[PDB]
């Protein structure tokens, strides 16, 4: 006696019991109700568009400092302001204010990095294989 | 004969103005680039890309990209279809880098 | 002067006679600030024995 029915004709209860208990899982609940993407940083998207508001570390005396590579960006989808990392100060250059930037998941609290500016990859500009259209 | 701007009726409610930029002048390539709503970029297919083609694109990229359409010309000069098709491929993909 | 964020490009030769074959676009940039004075300085070193 394991606290469960075992009769050969008790298939019904085992199913009904299983369906009820399956809702206990958070993973099962999120998958069925489609609320798993609330927790995602971009609300289910793989990348985030934004506007460059300011370059916080532009002044910072120390080259290639963690502050220098941070840029404040406002997400277009919701308008919430966040920070993004830039690969390096040279890449901090191609970014200028009011440019469109595509963001991707990555000083603590900065969880985003810039992968495109003005519709072109930052690495492409950094390797200098392309030129930013304005 | 065509000289200077030519305005033509193009639709029920749409009109176009054609301008043939002087090919030999850079100073021309700059100021047309600042006002051209559409660019018909002519490329010699047999010869391939040239300087003045590339420079104007760079002028456009810095002063605001307008609509750019690549037009390949002198394709009849090719003698084989294989090289014609293959040549078209590089010219397109290289055009896809700038635009 | 011009408003900030105005992009520009630079060329060294505009005459056909000196065209050569090299690329004629020399520099590209974005104007950052407008002012009526600047204080550019350079390193001057005095040497003694």
């Amino acid at each position: 006696g394991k606290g469960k029915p075992r009769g050969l004709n008790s298939a019904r209860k085992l199913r009904v019991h299983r369906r009820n208990n399956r809702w206990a899982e958070n993973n099962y609940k999120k998958r069925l109700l489609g609320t798993a993407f609330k927790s995602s940083p971009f609300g289910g998207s793989s990348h985030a568009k934004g506007i460059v508001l300011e370059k916080l570390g532009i002044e910072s005396k120390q080259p290639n400092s963690a502050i220098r590579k941070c840029v404040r960006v406002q997400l277009i989808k919701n308008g919430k302001k966040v920070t993004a990392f830039v690969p390096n100060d040279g890449c901090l250059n191609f970014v200028d204010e009011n440019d469109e930037v595509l963001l991707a998941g990555f000083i603590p609290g900065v969880r985003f990095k810039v992968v495109k500016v003005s519709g072109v990859s930052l690495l492409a500009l950094w390797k200098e294989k392309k030129e930013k259209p304005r | 004969d065509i000289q200077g701007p030519i305005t033509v009726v193009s639709g029920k409610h749409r009109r176009l103005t054609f301008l043939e930029c002087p090919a030999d002048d850079l100073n021309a390539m700059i100021d047309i680039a600042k006002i051209a709503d559409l660019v018909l970029l002519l490329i010699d297919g047999n010869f391939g890309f040239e300087m003045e083609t590339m420079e104007f694109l760079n002028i456009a990229q810095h002063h605001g990209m307008p609509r750019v359409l690549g037009v390949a010309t002198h394709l009849d000069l090719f003698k084989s279809q294989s090289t014609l098709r293959a040549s078209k491929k590089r010219l397109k993909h290289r055009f896809w880098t700038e635009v | 002067l011009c408003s900030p964020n105005t992009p520009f490009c630079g060329v060294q030769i505009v005459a056909n006679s000196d065209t050569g074959n090299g690329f004629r676009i020399a520099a590209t940039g974005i104007v950052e600030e407008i002012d009526v004075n600047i204080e550019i300085v350079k390193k001057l070193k005095l040497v003694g024995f």
Binding site: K127, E128, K129 | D44, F47, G48, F49, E50, M51, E52, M54, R94, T97 | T19, N21, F23
Partner: peptide, 25 residues
């Protein structure tokens, strides 16, 4: 009369680190 594009323009390899010949094969 025609100014053709040079090697740097055509390939657009850009800035890349030096890579040993052995990687080619």
């Amino acid at each position: 009369g025609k100014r053709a594009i040079n090697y740097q323009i055509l390939k657009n390899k850009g800035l890349t680190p030096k890579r040993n010949k052995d990687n080619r094969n």
